[PDB]
Design a protein around this ligand. Structure first.
Ligand code: HFT
Length: 242
């Protein structure tokens, strides 16, 4: 199981937010921690992506781009899985030290987005997603959002995406395989709308950060002000199965 051996070997370990849970919840503190957690997670997402089979087949300029565009979606999918495996979807497990109950979902002003992520988390259980299906689907998510004007070398990207779909095919393997593929691709598509709502929220917050006492880390601020608007303005779009 060469491919799956690799995906398991490179899967990131636990990442903490550094949040002060021994203090009353406040919008400012909760979002400052979400931003810090995001910066911390981005570091791991980059190291993970660069270690994926065939990733070096991509043009160097397309490598960071694909990571930046897919970052939110990758985080959402992984968080949903952690929430399912750790707390049976009872709460959103952003990090061991940043678990969201409904009060925090409300305090964070990200309630609608959080409920959708809780639903995604429940889906992992309802569809009985296996750890191996999770790993392969998460990898495919990295190759699911591209620019309309094209990547430096679109062909290398198209080949890589096809190969990851083939690997998902193998993990699944007739009618039974078809039904499963339908379920998984539907689940994958469902991550994009959620990531979009989070992109919009992060963007709006960054623009008003100076007035809400929210602090934005260097790399995150860069992605949110440079890459995210490309997605929100329609220049960069997700690749839906359906
Ligand atoms: C508000 C902002 C940009 O900090 C943010 O969405 N942060 C953030 C941090 C971590 C995680 N995570 O999955 O570990 C997520 C999210 F993907 F759940 F939504 C968002």
């Amino acid at each position: 199981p060469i491919f799956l051996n690799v995906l398991e070997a490179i899967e990131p370990g636990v990442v903490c937010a550094g949040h002060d849970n021994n203090q009353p919840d406040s919008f400012a503190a909760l979002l400052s921690s979400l931003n810090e957690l995001g910066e911390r997670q981005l570091v791991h997402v980059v190291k993970w992506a660069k270690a994926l089979p065939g990733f070096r087949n991509l043009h160097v300029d397309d490598q960071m781009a694909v990571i930046q565009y897919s970052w939110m979606g990758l985080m959402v999918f992984a968080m949903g899985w952690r929430s399912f495996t750790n707390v049976n979807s009872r709460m959103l497990y952003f990090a061991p030290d940043l678990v969201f109950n409904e009060y925090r979902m409300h305090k964070s002003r990200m309630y609608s987005q959080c409920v959708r992520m809780r639903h995604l988390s429940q889906e992992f259980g309802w569809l009985q997603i296996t750890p191996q299906e999770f790993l392969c689907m998460k990898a495919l998510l990295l190759f699911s959002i591209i620019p309309v004007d094209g990547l430096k070398n679109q062909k290398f990207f198209d080949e890589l995406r096809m190969n990851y779909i083939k690997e998902l095919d193998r993990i699944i393997a007739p009618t039974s395989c078809s039904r499963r593929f339908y379920q998984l691709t539907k689940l994958l598509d469902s991550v994009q709308p959620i990531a979009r709502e989070l992109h919009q929220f992060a963007f709006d917050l960054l623009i008003k950060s100076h007035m809400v006492s929210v602090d934005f880390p260097e790399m995150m601020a860069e992605i949110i002000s440079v890459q995210v608007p490309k997605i929100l303005s329609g220049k960069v779009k997700p690749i839906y199965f359906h």
